Design a protein around this ligand. Structure first.
Ligand code: DGD
Ligand code: LMG
Ligand code: SQD
Lengths: 48, 127
């Protein structure tokens, strides 16, 4: 059972058993969060 | 496909201006860009109406200066020069020379040369 239960995952390179979907999802979340940084930096530094 | 190579020049000013354009295009939301675009469109329509009224008044001044300078005979105005003022094809020197020409000899249909387009200024690596 260990074959399916944490051996072929523990012994494999995690680049293999990880979809590119989650990498694209994390990158999209990151780029959506840090998208207003130039405008907010300009608004803070150009303020009073 | 037909970009002039003077607009592909890499300079310090264009390096700075890339930041302004990047903040405009990928740094500012298209919703706020759209409402600013609507506001600029309305303001430009208002300034076009103002310029059209100013051009019509300049036609009236053209007739007045063409009377004072030819006595009372020539009292018309050049409609081609009116469209030239409206399309911004006249230099201020051309406008002054034409006005002076009307004021002291008349000759409405004797027009100054059309101003050439201003070429893009270049200063080595600066701009
Ligand atoms: C029905 C909806 C209700 C609201 C709609 C209308 C009410 C109010 C409209 C906006 C406020 C007043 C705008 C007046 C001047 C425009 C500001 C500006 O600088 O000019 C903006 C320019 C104009 O847009 C672009 O402009 C380009 C460049 O042209 C011009 O670009 C510049 C214009 O500033 C220079 O003047 C330059 O000389 C001239 O060529 C193109 O020509 C096109 O016109 C267009 O792509 O944009 C740019 O480059 C800059 C992009 C970001 C700037 C954002 C400024 C304002 C954002 C308001 C957000 C609040 C949201 C709540 C809604 C309520 C709104 C208050
Ligand atoms: C005292 C010495 C001088 C001190 C400062 C005085 C300013 C001198 C600038 C005026 C020169 C006008 C001239 O050359 O006319 C002669 C120019 C030449 O004319 C144009 O020349 C072009 C080049 O070939 C093309 O041929 C065009 O077809 C032609 O119309 O005529 C014009 O009036 C065209 C527009 C002038 C350009 C802007 C004037 C600069 C001053 C205003 C800017 C204000 C900014 C302040 C900051
Ligand atoms: C004192 C320093 C003055 C600096 C030079 C002033 C005029 C130069 C010019 O042609 O302005 C052209 C610039 C764009 O630069 C132009 O920008 C072009 C790209 S774009 O128009 O933003 O799409 C770029 O291709 C080109 O190399 C760059 O000159 O257009 C402007 O909007 C001028 C605003 C600032 C003045």
């Amino acid at each position: 059972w260990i074959a399916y239960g944490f051996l072929v995952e523990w012994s494999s390179d995690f680049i293999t058993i990880i979809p590119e979907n989650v990498d694209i999802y994390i990158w999209n979340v990151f780029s959506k969060i840090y998208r207003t940084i130039p405008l907010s930096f300009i608004s803070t530094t150009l303020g009073p | 496909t037909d970009i002039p190579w003077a607009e592909k020049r890499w300079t310090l000013f264009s390096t700075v201006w890339y930041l302004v354009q990047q903040l405009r295009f990928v740094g500012t939301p298209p919703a706020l860009r759209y409402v600013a675009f609507l506001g600029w469109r309305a303001l430009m329509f208002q300034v076009y109406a103002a310029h059209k009224a100013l051009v019509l008044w300049q036609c009236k001044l053209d007739a007045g200066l063409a009377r004072i300078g030819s006595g009372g005979a020539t009292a018309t105005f050049s409609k081609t020069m009116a469209l030239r003022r409206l399309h911004w094809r006249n230099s201020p020197l051309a406008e002054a020379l034409y006005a002076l020409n009307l004021y002291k000899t008349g000759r409405v249909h004797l027009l100054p040369p059309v101003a050439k387009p201003i070429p893009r200024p270049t200063f080595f690596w600066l701009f």
